[PDB]
Structure formats: structure tokens, C-alpha cells
Scaffold this active site. Sequence first.
Site, mmCIF file in Angstrom:
data_model
loop_
_atom_site.group_PDB
_atom_site.id
_atom_site.type_symbol
_atom_site.label_atom_id
_atom_site.label_comp_id
_atom_site.label_asym_id
_atom_site.label_seq_id
_atom_site.Cartn_x
_atom_site.Cartn_y
_atom_site.Cartn_z
ATOM 1 N N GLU A 14 0.680 -1.289 -0.222
ATOM 2 C CA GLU A 14 -0.040 -0.002 -0.388
ATOM 3 C C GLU A 14 0.832 0.946 -0.130
ATOM 4 O O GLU A 14 0.894 2.137 -0.665
ATOM 5 C CB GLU A 14 -0.783 0.378 1.722
ATOM 6 C CG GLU A 14 -2.085 -0.752 1.415
ATOM 7 C CD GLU A 14 -2.963 -0.750 -0.317
ATOM 8 O OE1 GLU A 14 -3.278 0.490 -0.822
ATOM 9 O OE2 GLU A 14 -4.216 -1.251 0.045
ATOM 10 N N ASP B 128 -13.012 10.105 -8.069
ATOM 11 C CA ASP B 128 -14.440 10.794 -7.302
ATOM 12 C C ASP B 128 -14.142 11.417 -5.841
ATOM 13 O O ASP B 128 -14.655 11.044 -5.083
ATOM 14 C CB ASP B 128 -14.851 8.409 -6.595
ATOM 15 C CG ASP B 128 -13.744 8.125 -5.806
ATOM 16 O OD1 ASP B 128 -12.718 8.370 -5.109
ATOM 17 O OD2 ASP B 128 -14.510 8.095 -4.743
ATOM 18 N N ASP C 257 -6.532 8.476 -0.323
ATOM 19 C CA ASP C 257 -5.965 7.153 0.652
ATOM 20 C C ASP C 257 -5.120 7.590 1.565
ATOM 21 O O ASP C 257 -4.117 8.667 0.919
ATOM 22 C CB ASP C 257 -5.792 6.191 0.004
ATOM 23 C CG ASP C 257 -6.084 6.167 -1.522
ATOM 24 O OD1 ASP C 257 -7.605 5.609 -0.564
ATOM 25 O OD2 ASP C 257 -6.041 5.415 -2.591
ATOM 26 N N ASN D 154 -7.523 10.192 -5.669
ATOM 27 C CA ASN D 154 -8.197 9.461 -6.370
ATOM 28 C C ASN D 154 -9.870 10.293 -7.747
ATOM 29 O O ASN D 154 -10.709 10.638 -6.866
ATOM 30 C CB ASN D 154 -8.801 8.400 -5.865
ATOM 31 C CG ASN D 154 -8.589 8.070 -4.612
ATOM 32 O OD1 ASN D 154 -7.567 6.785 -5.581
ATOM 33 N ND2 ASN D 154 -8.400 7.771 -3.309
ATOM 34 N N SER E 139 -11.936 11.265 -3.826
ATOM 35 C CA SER E 139 -11.456 10.548 -2.543
ATOM 36 C C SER E 139 -9.598 10.537 -1.970
ATOM 37 O O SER E 139 -9.299 11.167 -3.395
ATOM 38 C CB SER E 139 -11.854 9.317 -2.065
ATOM 39 O OG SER E 139 -11.853 8.692 -3.201
ATOM 40 N N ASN F 293 -8.926 4.935 2.961
ATOM 41 C CA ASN F 293 -9.725 6.296 1.943
ATOM 42 C C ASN F 293 -10.623 7.154 2.748
ATOM 43 O O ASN F 293 -11.598 6.411 3.829
ATOM 44 C CB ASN F 293 -10.009 5.625 1.095
ATOM 45 C CG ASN F 293 -10.994 6.121 -0.263
ATOM 46 O OD1 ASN F 293 -12.184 6.970 0.358
ATOM 47 N ND2 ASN F 293 -10.141 6.530 -1.052
#
Length: 130
Positions: free
Chosen positions: A35, A49, A53, A46, A51, A60
Site C-alpha cells: 500500500e 471519485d 488514500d 483518486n 477521494s 480512504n
Amino acid sequence: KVFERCELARTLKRLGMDGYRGISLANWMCLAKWESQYNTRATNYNAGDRSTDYGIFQINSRYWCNDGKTPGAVNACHLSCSALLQDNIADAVACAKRVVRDPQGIRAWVAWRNRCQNRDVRQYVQGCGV
């Protein structure tokens, strides 16, 4: 902070992650590794959308933490996404535990499925004293 492998394994172990909800320490190590390459200040926006992380587990903003800029998002871990960018991982670990308290378990992270599921993950904790 960029954790060294074994340093992170003992840190996670001291935080109660070994076997939490049946998830071995080796799986958690494989997750953090893929990750963020063990980096607590890692972030990924992102654009698709709106968002983002956050941190070592790349949690998220849509459901787990509040950053104030993700439309109609919730905050199930009851934390500012900033808490997920600290060198100390206690808060990120508390949130990761919260994520896996849901139906999918460790499968909540697609990367775990892609590179950890049904794989030999022993190498992540070997020699760490855990």
C-alpha cells in the site's frame, strides 16, 4: 516516517495486530508494504471519485476519515485524515482494526487481494522476533 521491515513488525505486534480478527501479522505487513512501501505520509488522490488514500495502510477518505473535501463522505474511524499521516501509527492501527471489523475483513483492501491473498507471506516477518 518510512519504517524498516522488522521495526514495523514489532510495532504492529505491540499495538495488538497479531491475529486481530484472525489476521496474522504477516498479512498486515504485506498490506502496508504494497500500500505504501511502509511510509506513514503516503497519499494517493483518486481524481475519479474525489477521494484520497492516507498513510501506511492507504485508508480512504470516503468512509474512514474526514478530510473535509470528499463529497458525501463519512468518518467511521472518527478521525481527521491527518491522524493517518503521523509518524506514530497507533491511530492508523485503530482505524485499520475498524476497517476489518466489517464483512470483508482484510479483503477490504484490493491490493491485499492482488498481492497477499493466497501467497507465501512468511518473508515479511522472518527474523523480526515476532
